[PDB]
Structure formats: structure tokens, C-alpha cells
Amino acid sequence: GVRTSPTGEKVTHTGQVYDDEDYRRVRFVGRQKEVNENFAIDLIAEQPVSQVGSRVISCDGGGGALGHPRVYINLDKETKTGTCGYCGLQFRQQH
Amino acid sequence: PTVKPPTARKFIWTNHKFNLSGTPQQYVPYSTTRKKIQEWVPPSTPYK
Amino acid sequence: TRPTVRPRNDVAHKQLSAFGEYVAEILPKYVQQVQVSCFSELEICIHPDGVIPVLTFLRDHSNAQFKSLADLTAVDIPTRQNRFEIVYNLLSLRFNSRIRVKTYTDELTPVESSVSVYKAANWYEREIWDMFGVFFANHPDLRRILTDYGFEGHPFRKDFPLSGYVELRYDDEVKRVVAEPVELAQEFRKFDLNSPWEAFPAYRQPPE
Amino acid sequence: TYKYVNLREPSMDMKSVTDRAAQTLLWTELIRGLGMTLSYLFREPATINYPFEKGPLSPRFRGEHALRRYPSGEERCIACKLCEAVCPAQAITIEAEPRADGSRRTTRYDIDMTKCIYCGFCQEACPVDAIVEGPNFEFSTETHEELLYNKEKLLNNGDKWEAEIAANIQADYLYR
Amino acid sequence: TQLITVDEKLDITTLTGVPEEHIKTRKARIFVPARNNMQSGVNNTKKWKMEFDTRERWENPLM
Amino acid sequence: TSVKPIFSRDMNEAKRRVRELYRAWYREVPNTVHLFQLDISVKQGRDKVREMFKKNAHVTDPRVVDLLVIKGKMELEETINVWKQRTHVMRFFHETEAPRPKDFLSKFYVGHDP
Amino acid sequence: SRGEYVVAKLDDLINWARRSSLWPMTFGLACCAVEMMHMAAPRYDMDRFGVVFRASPRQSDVMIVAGTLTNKMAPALRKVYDQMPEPRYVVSMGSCANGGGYYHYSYSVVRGCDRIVPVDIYVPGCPPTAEALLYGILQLQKKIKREKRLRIWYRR
Amino acid sequence: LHHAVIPHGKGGRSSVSGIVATVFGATGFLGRYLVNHLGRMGSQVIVPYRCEPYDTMHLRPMGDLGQIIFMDWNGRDKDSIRRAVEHSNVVINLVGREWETKNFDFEDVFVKIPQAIAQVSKEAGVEKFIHISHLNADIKSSSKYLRNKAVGEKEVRETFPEATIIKPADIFGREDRFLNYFANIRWFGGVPLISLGKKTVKQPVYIVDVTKGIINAIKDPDARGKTFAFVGPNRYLLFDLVQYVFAVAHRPFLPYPMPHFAYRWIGRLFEISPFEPWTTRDKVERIHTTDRTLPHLPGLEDLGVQATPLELKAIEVLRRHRTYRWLSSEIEDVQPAKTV
Ligand SMILES: CCCCCCCCCCCCCCCCCC(=O)OC[C@H](COP(=O)(O)OCCN)OC(=O)CCCCCCCCCCCCCCCCC
Ligand SMILES: NC(=O)C1=CN([C@@H]2O[C@H](COP(=O)(O)OP(=O)(O)OC[C@H]3O[C@@H](n4cnc5c(N)ncnc54)[C@H](OP(=O)(O)O)[C@@H]3O)[C@@H](O)[C@H]2O)C=CC1
Ligand code: SF4
Ligand code: SF4
Ligand code: SF4
Ligand SMILES: [Zn+2]
């Protein structure tokens, strides 16, 4: 989900884009601006919320030692889903 | 990889690119941060 | 304390303390302090005026025979009025031992060169003149050995910054390598890494 | 506990003296050296045919740097700044801010490849296996500024070499 | 006696190799550093420090 | 206040050594002009020598001026033999550095430095 | 036109002769010179590609800056590059010869050899391996191959 | 004023100067000196090159990283010019040829190309345009060089009212074609001149003075719209100038009379070479043309640049042409020429 600036330049996931009057675009004429089209926010927004039947849950990111440090997430609030600090996966108590 | 293929993911490139240095498709470095200080734009109306 | 703690050598500690007492009582004119570290190393802090009469003793006495000069070093500690600390490391092949001799001087007072004791120091203290500014009196050839030919200042002093005051670049107008004031593209980021909690209670200085 | 190298005393008898004189007048050991070169002429040379025949490597090889991802699309780095604090040549510059969904993510991640010494301190100090040292080493450029990698280049390198980086980590993760 | 009498003040300004611009325009500060209030340890406030005034730091055009 | 002298017991011997060093430099300048093939005149080199000597003219300490004489003799020895290059000799003439602003107004115009 | 084809074929011939007969100079400073000698080892065998070391700058084609270019060394390197006959190419290898490497903030280190001499190919690493240096040499050969000297001379 | 154009630093190599300069024809002599002076201040220089990129390689150590952007351009293509000048705030024109090639004549280099560059710079919003012409440019001159240079100067002034036109007299330097040409006449014979060259008066100017004048004119807000004339401090005759050149180079000087009509006859013989010619008829005409005096045009002194005399840099220029016997002689071992 990369939007295009009115100058034709692409906008990164950070939101960086050179202005119309910015001279530094001379570094891009005759060449290309390297941006990544796989945005992490849009890809993590497509992950479904996992329903679990426990008050607290443990997340390690998957793979065991190949993931992030294991953390514990509380799911007492029913209005919002508890999200992992590292992986961004969200869990919900099904009650 | 014919007998032991790697695990496929959504973000992995399906088209490999060789060394692009010296080509028009070469990498150009740039800052990836927004502007820090926001200047005060003057009003577009005279004081009269 | 068996598998992790480094084993302690007490026989070498006792022998080095006895030899330190021996050296201190042989030369009471120049020897100021004698200490033995916890890992069994002997330090003889002496007066600068006895740089020569001590070293030759350790070179020529039948009970010392420190025939090898391993390293000649200088330490810059700006908190003292005599900021420079010249350290000699001696190796005795006959008795299979090592000793350390320390002395102090400031920027202006010269100290006597030991080229008549060990000739390796002919280069070594010359290196000190290149990087600390300690002038060694009575030297055959004292000049710069490591820095640039037109370099000014002593780089290993603590008040000297990391990057120098000049840098070299090629200029095509004068067809020459020219020196210009330094302008770092990215500054060396100074990190504050000192822990605010006391670590070793055994080295706790008494308060004022 | 020591041996007397080069202290053997030569002989004196007439046969050995005649042998030494014959070796002097007829150059026997020069013929021995010629024979050793002639023996080395008839061996298989150890030359590989680059670039069709790459030299052997190891899965622990340190080359170009890359940024990994979790197996859902999310980038692994959470901007903890351990790699830039452990980098000995200060090649890593990190700037971070909370993004739209409140996740601790980077905004600037720059590695200066001309400053980097390729020692793998960042790939071993990373708590979430985000930054890795990939196995690529054929990435020489024609310009100096092309060796100044920003976050986008590192993410593209990670997406390019994930299929190899994951296998190398799966091979070598039990030794760490 | 091999000793002389020197009564003038010390001056190593001409031997340190520093240019005069970074001698006559600098203003050093000698202070005991302030304790970090986020922590509670007091070991960083033991020794006096000499620091210099902060000069201009700008942004690189490239990176 | 009793210190250890380096070479001069008082100011007279030190300024005599300064005088001898200046004589040696003044004699040496035409040879370094000739050998290094510099594009400058002998008078320019001699006035540069005079400027470098008058830069340290405020020193009233025998040990400091003794060290200055030692460093000057070291530089003279380094330039008698060709150990310095043309760049090292010509670095006394800042031919590539633009003159900085001098008065208050131009320094106010060009930056924040005092 | 036939003249354009003639100058194109002549440019191809001279580029082939210049790129298949590279003569570097025996010039190392540090660790990266040890890796360069390992590129000269029997395994990688630079002399297969016509790459043979020459001691004198007057009979050399390229110069490989392998090591740390310090402040005391830069005039010597500049004079050595100046003495080489045209056409001359410089391959910068190692982090020290690229941007200062470990010693970027040192007082007596030139931050890259680009400040002294023009550079064609930058080879990154510490040290960049003999395989990587051979790859850089082949990349330099490819850069020489696509030169357009006589074509531009005909156009000018 | 955008925040990326505000100057910063101490004016060093890594500082920001806020000058975005497009130097057309920067792969030459004056272009090389101008790029060197701009790059040491920390400026973004866009260099459009027509020749081989290898010849641009010497322009690489001339500034910091990312400061010099090389790009292809064509003199008859306005699209490449608009690609090059679309972000710069100062455009400098150094395009010139001492001879006429098969593809380009003097009108294609001095008339059409500067007019196209100035028009594209005007339509792209560039606030500063600087053009380089010749001091002796006039319509009625015998040489086609000065005629076309005057025509191009008039067209540039017409299409760009704020253009700063700079007219050097005759620039000498290490890579010039003025003193080196005189030192290289000695191969052919005994350096012939028109009536011994005792009637033409010339005042050559150092290259660094012209470069500093251009830099100051870029930095001067009051230099827009003017027509400067860059001249040397002393006016010499041609005979004494050649005499001083051969005295510095330590070569024998044996001049001889030779008529004006026969000089062009052999001058056109050297121009039939397909490579760069040694001399042409136009070079003979411009060498034997006396430098006009225009006191109304402001000079190097009004831009704060002191004119360096020829006696200070002539030895530096001409030490390459000496033999081994007199290679080590100093600067002061020569007699300076008499000025008028
Ligand atoms: C009107 C028509 C005529 C017009 C005038 C032109 C006349 C002919 C001029 C010479 C030939 C021009 C063409 C030159 C080659 C062009 C094609 C080319 O570059 O081929 C590349 C190929 C090698 O490819 P490479 O990139 O090295 O592959 C990697 C290997 N894994 O290269 C090869 O496979 C080898 C190429 C060999 C080229 C020919 C042999 C050399 C020249 C011999 C004749 C001249 C010299 C005679 C002797 C002089 C004294 C020694
Ligand atoms: N004698 C002197 O030095 C004097 C010179 N001048 C003027 O000053 C200017 C600068 O002189 P200078 O640099 O030394 O001259 P040069 O001939 O040495 O260099 C000309 C430059 O412009 C380029 N160029 C020339 N013709 C064309 C063209 N038709 N199309 C595209 N690019 C072209 C050249 O590139 P490439 O390498 O591709 O040819 C080169 O970069 C010129 O206009 C000259 O007339 C004025 C007074 C005195
Ligand atoms: S490999 Fe080492 S030098 Fe390179 S970025 Fe990582 S920590 Fe820094
Ligand atoms: S160590 Fe890993 S998680 Fe921490 S800032 Fe570096 S790349 Fe990100
Ligand atoms: S880049 Fe690394 S391997 Fe090469 S010379 Fe420098 S420290 Fe040695
Ligand atoms: Zn998780």
C-alpha cells in the first residue's frame, strides 16, 4: 500500500517524501528511489485475532528459540484485544 | 533445493535480481526521517 | 570458588614481597613505594632522579639479573600535578621473573634516558616523545617516530581529542595533499555507560 | 625439552668426501629441486573455475546485512538499540518513534558498510533475531554512497535472502 | 645544585598544539555532575568533571 | 618553586639558543626553496620563518622556550634531509583555506560562533 | 554509417585488449593485502584472467588500495597514482580504503581513499574475501568492456 | 528559502553552503577549477557530461559524498537540459571550443547552445545565470570565434535579463592553452610573429582569480545584470610576453618576421588533423589581436579579488617545459618583462 506523491515520488512506510521545492531530488533523477512495497502495518493488520479460553496467555512469536522473548498478556478487558509487544499478534478471551 | 525446498513466505521475492550497480536501477541513499522543526508560515493577509 | 574463580598463587606472592623488601632496603635513596598486586605482580614506585641507578642495579646484580626490557610505557593522568607516569617492565631470564618500575614527571621537567641500560629503549622512550611530550634528556636521536612529519601536538594525551585538529585531502588547484580543519560527516557519539551503583566495595575510597 | 638444530658435524672419510666432491662438481641437490618442480608439474592444479565454481563456505559466514521478518509479515525489530550500542565502529544509526498502531518500530535504521567491520556483534546482540549477517559477499558497488544502507535497502535485502537466512539460522541456532 | 628558580605562572599553551581559535573562544565548565533522577545511585557524582561548551551541529545533506 | 632546568639556567642562554636557531633557519631557507622546487621566493620563506618565530614571542618561561627550541631543531633536521615532502613544507602556507571572518558583523552573518 | 561500425569494432577491440590484460601493482598496506595474496594463491589464480602483478607504476594498469591509508602515507599514494600512465583504474578494497573502517574517527587516518585518488570500484568487507576481490576485478573488467571512447570521439 | 538551502557549518568540505550549481561544460579547464572551488565549500554540483565517464573521474575527489551528481546531456536536446537545471538555483555556462569540428561549428557552440541553456534556465525558475564570454568579442572582428561569441552574448543578454556575463581576457594556468601553446611553438621552428608581435597588447589573467570572481559573483546579490571584464594587472606586448615565456622555460628564443597572409596558410595546415588540432587560423587571429580596454565594465577589484600578476605563477606554469639542465632554477633567476 504505497501512495504516490503529486511529484511522482513514492512514500515510504515511515512517511518520508521529498518536497516539491527540495533540491535533494537531484539524487533520484536518472535513477530510482528504493522503497519496500511490503508494509508491516498492513501485513500485521491482516492477521486474525486468536480466540483463547484463558485469562492470561503466553506468547513467544512461534518457533521457540527463533522468536522473541516469551511474554504474558492479560485479556481481562473485553472491549479491546491484548496485543503482543514484539510480534504484534492479538489475542482475545472468547467469553 | 529440489529435494529440500525452503519455506515459502508472502514477502519473499519471486524474481531474483543480480548486482544492479552502475545501472539506472541502482540503489540511491536517502534519509528516512521526517522534518524535525516546523517553521511558522506567515499569514496571507495584510495588517491593514 | 573452584570452577569459576581464578586460582590464587601465594608462594609467588610471598617471594615477590620478600624481593620487594630486599630492593627497598638495598636502595632507600630512590625507592618510594613497593606493592604487590593480587595476581602476584611487583611494582616499585621510585623517584625519577633514580631512573638510572635503580635499573642498572636490576640489570647487573647477581640476585636480580633483569636482562630484558619488555615494555616501556607512559600513562597520562591529568588529576595529578605530575600527570605523566613512566613505567618500565623488566624480564629476568635467569630467575624467571618480571618486575615493574614506576616513576612520575610533568610536562616540563625532563627525565634521564636509559639508553645506557637497555638499547631497545632507544626507540621506546622516543615513541613517548612522539605521543606524550615527555622530553628524555641525554638521548642520541630524539624525534618523531609514529605521527605525521608536520604533525603538531601529542595525540595520546588525554586533553587531546580523538579526532585531530587537521585532516588531509587532495586539492587539484595546488595539485597537492593539503591540511584543513576537521569536519566530521557524522560526529563520534559519546556514550554514557557508567553504572550509577557501586560495584566493588573493596576499593571504596573514604569520603572527604 | 630442546633440540640442537644445525649442530651436526660433517664426516671426514674418503668415500664421504668423494661423495661431497661429486655433489659439488655435478650439482646433485639442484637436480633434486628440478625433480621436485617436475613432480609438481604433473599434479592436478587446485584452481577452481570462478564464477562457475564457487569456493566452499560455511553456514556461519558473515557477509551482507539484512533485516528479517516474523512469519506473518511483521518486521522483527522493535528498536531496542542494542546493536548500535554494541557496534564497535559505530556503523549503526537508529531513530525510533511510536507508529500509528502504537507499536515500537524504527523510523531510521542506517548501516554504513564502509564503517562496518563484519564481526557479527549486531546479529548476536539482537534479542529478536531481527538484524542478521547474510551469506552474500558479491555486492561490490561502483560508487561510495551506494555502500550507505538505509532501512529500505536492508528490508529489501532481507526479503531477497530470507529463503537462505532462515535455513542458515535453523542450521546454526543450536550452537548459540 | 642543578636547580633553578622559576617564579612565573605555568603556560603550556604554545606546546599543546591547539589552535588559538579553540583556546581564546572556549569556555570550560568544572562541575560535579548531577545525579540522574530516574535512578537512585550516587556513584556518578563522586569526581569533578571538566566539560566544554556545545558548538553548532547540523544535518548532513545525504543521510 | 625550585624546578629542574632543561638546557638554560636563565633567560639569557635560552634566548641565545633561540638566536642560534633563527640563524640556522635563515641559512637553511634557500636550500629548501631550491631542493623542493617551491614556487615561492626566498623572502616569502624568510618572512614565514619570522612570523613563526614571532608567534611564540610572549613566552617568559625557560623550560617552555627550551622545549620550543628543541622542537624547532627537530623540524630543522626534518627539513634539511628530505623527510618532509612538498606538502609538509607548504602546509605552513595555508593556500587552500579561505580567510575566516574577522569583525563582529561578518561572524554574526555567517554562523553562531563567537 | 560504415565509419560508425568501424569505430565501434575498434573500440570493442581496444576494450578487449585493455580488459583482458590488466596489470595491477604490488601495493599493499595491511590485512587486505594478505587477502590479495590469497587471491593470488593457486586456488583463485588471478593469472588465469591475465591479472599479473607488476612492481613498477610505469608498467602497471590498475592500483588496488588494500589497507589503511593513513595521514603519513597519503602523499606517497598520490604520487604513485600520478606516476601511472593512462588509462588508469583504482579498485578500493576493504573498509579502511573505503570509509576508514574501524579507524574512521582516528586522528591520523584518511577517511577513505576517495579523498586522495579517483576510485572506480569499491569492494566492501573486512577483509573482503579473495572470491569477493576476484568478483570486483571481474566487475572492473565489465566496466572497461562497456567503455565508449572512440564512439564518443566520432560523435564529438 | 527552503530549510535544505539554509547554510550551515564553518564552510568546509562537509558543511552546507546552499549553492546548487549546474556547471555546463565542467569537464574542461575553467570548469575543473570552478568545480574545485565550489566543492570545497560544501555545495551540491550537478555536472552534465558529454564525453567519456572516465574523463569525469578526476571530478570525483572534488567534493564530499553525494555532492557531485554526474548526468548525461546533449547540446541540441532541451529535455536533458531541463532535466539538469530543474532543481538548481545557479546555472553557469562554460561551453566553448577553440576549433570547429565536423558535427559542431562555432555557431552551434557559442550561439545556439548558450541561448538554449539560458532559455531553459529561465523557464525552469533558476534565479542566477552566469555566462562566460571573451573580452575581445565584437561583431566586426576578423575571427569567427569572437563574432559568434559577441552574437551569443547578445542573445544571452536578450533572453535572460539577470544573466551575469563575464569576459576574461586570456586565461593562463597549468592546463591552459595560452602559455603552453607559446612554449610548444618551439618544436616547429623559431616562433614566427606578425611584425614581431610588437603591435598587439595583451593582459592575461590567472585562472584562480577568474574562479574567485565567479564564486563572488554567485555570492553577490548586486552582480545580477552586470557585464564584468576580467583582466590582468599589467599590459604586455606580445614580443616581450613570448620573450618572458621562453626565458622562464629556459629555451633559445630566435624570432623572425613572417607575413600575416602566410601565417594562416600554415595555420590551416595543422587543422586538417582529425584529432585535436595544434593550431588553426582562428588561433592565429586571436593570438595576434590586441586586448581592448573597457574601463566602464567593473573588474576583479570590484568583486573583492586581487589580480595575481604573471610573474608569480609563470614559473609554476612553465616548469614542465624546462630541460633537466635548468629544472632546478628558482623563480627569481629571470628578468621580468617590460609592461606598457
Ligand atoms: C569493415 C569491417 C572491419 C572493420 C574494422 C575492424 C576489424 C577487426 C577489429 C578486431 C576485432 C573486433 C572485435 C573484438 C571482439 C568483440 C566481441 C567481444 O568483446 O567478445 C568477447 C569475447 C570474450 O567474452 P568475455 O566477456 O571475455 O567472456 C567471459 C568469459 N567467461 O571475446 C572473445 O571471445 C575473443 C575476442 C577476440 C578478438 C579477435 C582477436 C584479437 C585481434 C586480432 C587481430 C588484431 C591484432 C593482430 C596482431 C597484433 C600483434 C600481436
Ligand atoms: N583561453 C581561455 O582559457 C579562455 C576561455 N574562455 C572561455 O571560457 C570557457 C571555458 O573554457 P575551457 O573550459 O578552458 O574550454 P575547453 O575547450 O577546454 O572545455 C570546454 C568544456 O565544454 C565542453 N564542451 C565544449 N564544446 C561542447 C559542445 N559542443 N557540446 C557540449 N559540451 C561541449 C567540453 O566537454 P568535452 O570534453 O566533451 O569536449 C568541456 O567540458 C569557454 O567558453 C571559452 O571560450 C574565455 C576567455 C579565455
Ligand atoms: S557486523 Fe559488527 S561492525 Fe558491522 S554493523 Fe554489526 S556490530 Fe557493527
Ligand atoms: S538489536 Fe535487533 S531489535 Fe534491537 S535495535 Fe538492533 S535490530 Fe532492532
Ligand atoms: S578493512 Fe579490515 S581487513 Fe582490511 S585492512 Fe582494514 S582492518 Fe584489515
Ligand atoms: Zn509474541
From TrEMBL, chain A:
GO annotation terms (biological process): mitochondrial electron transport, NADH to ubiquinone
An annotated GO cellular component: respiratory chain complex I
Name the UniProt record assigns to this protein: NADH dehydrogenase [ubiquinone] iron-sulfur protein 6, mitochondrial
Membrane topology category: Peripheral membrane protein
Positions of the Zinc finger CHCC-type domain: 55-91
Family: Belongs to the complex I NDUFS6 subunit family.
Main location: mitochondrion
Function: Accessory subunit of the mitochondrial membrane respiratory chain NADH dehydrogenase (Complex I), that is believed not to be involved in catalysis. Complex I functions in the transfer of electrons from NADH to the respiratory chain. The immediate electron acceptor for the enzyme is believed to be ubiquinone.
Cellular localization per UniProt: Mitochondrion inner membrane
Keywords, sorted A to Z: Electron transport, Membrane, Metal-binding, Mitochondrion, Mitochondrion inner membrane, Respiratory chain, Transit peptide, Transport, Zinc
Subunit structure: Mammalian complex I is composed of 45 different subunits. This is a component of the iron-sulfur (IP) fragment of the enzyme.
Domain of life: Eukaryota
Organism: Ovis aries (Sheep)
Residues reported to bind Zn(2+): 59, 68, 84, 87
TrEMBL record, chain D:
A cellular component term, taken from the record's GO annotations: mitochondrial inner membrane
GO molecular function, one term: NADH dehydrogenase activity
Binding site for [4Fe-4S] cluster 2: 87, 116, 119, 122
Record keyword Transcription present: no
GO terms of biological process kind: mitochondrial electron transport, NADH to ubiquinone; mitochondrial respiratory chain complex I assembly
Top EC category: translocase
Positions of [4Fe-4S] cluster 1 binding: 77, 80, 83, 126
EC numbers, comma separated: 7.1.1.2
Cofactors (names): [4Fe-4S] cluster
Family, as annotated: Belongs to the complex I 23 kDa subunit family.
Entry protein name: NADH dehydrogenase [ubiquinone] iron-sulfur protein 8, mitochondrial
Automatic annotation (TrEMBL), chain F:
Domain Complex 1 LYR protein: 21-78
Mode of membrane association: Peripheral membrane protein
UniProt subcellular location: Mitochondrion inner membrane
InterPro entries: Complex1_LYR_dom, Complex1_LYR_NDUFA6_LYRM6, NADH_Ub_cplx-1_asu_su-6
Keyword Electron transport attributed: yes
GO BP field: mitochondrial respiratory chain complex I assembly; response to oxidative stress
Organism superkingdom: Eukaryota
Keywords of this entry: Electron transport, Membrane, Mitochondrion, Mitochondrion inner membrane, Respiratory chain, Transport
GO cellular component: mitochondrial inner membrane; respiratory chain complex I
Function, in words: Accessory subunit of the mitochondrial membrane respiratory chain NADH dehydrogenase (Complex I), that is believed to be not involved in catalysis. Complex I functions in the transfer of electrons from NADH to the respiratory chain. The immediate electron acceptor for the enzyme is believed to be ubiquinone. Accessory subunit of the mitochondrial membrane respiratory chain NADH dehydrogenase (Complex I), that is believed to be not involved in catalysis. Required for proper complex I assembly. Complex I functions in the transfer of electrons from NADH to the respiratory chain. The immediate electron acceptor for the enzyme is believed to be ubiquinone.
Family assignment from sequence similarity: Belongs to the complex I LYR family.
PANTHER family, A to Z: NADH DEHYDROGENASE [UBIQUINONE] 1 ALPHA SUBCOMPLEX SUBUNIT 6, NADH-UBIQUINONE OXIDOREDUCTASE B14 SUBUNIT
Subunit relationships: Mammalian complex I is composed of 45 different subunits.
Name of the protein in question: NADH dehydrogenase [ubiquinone] 1 alpha subcomplex subunit 6
Source organism: Capra hircus
Gene: NDUFA6
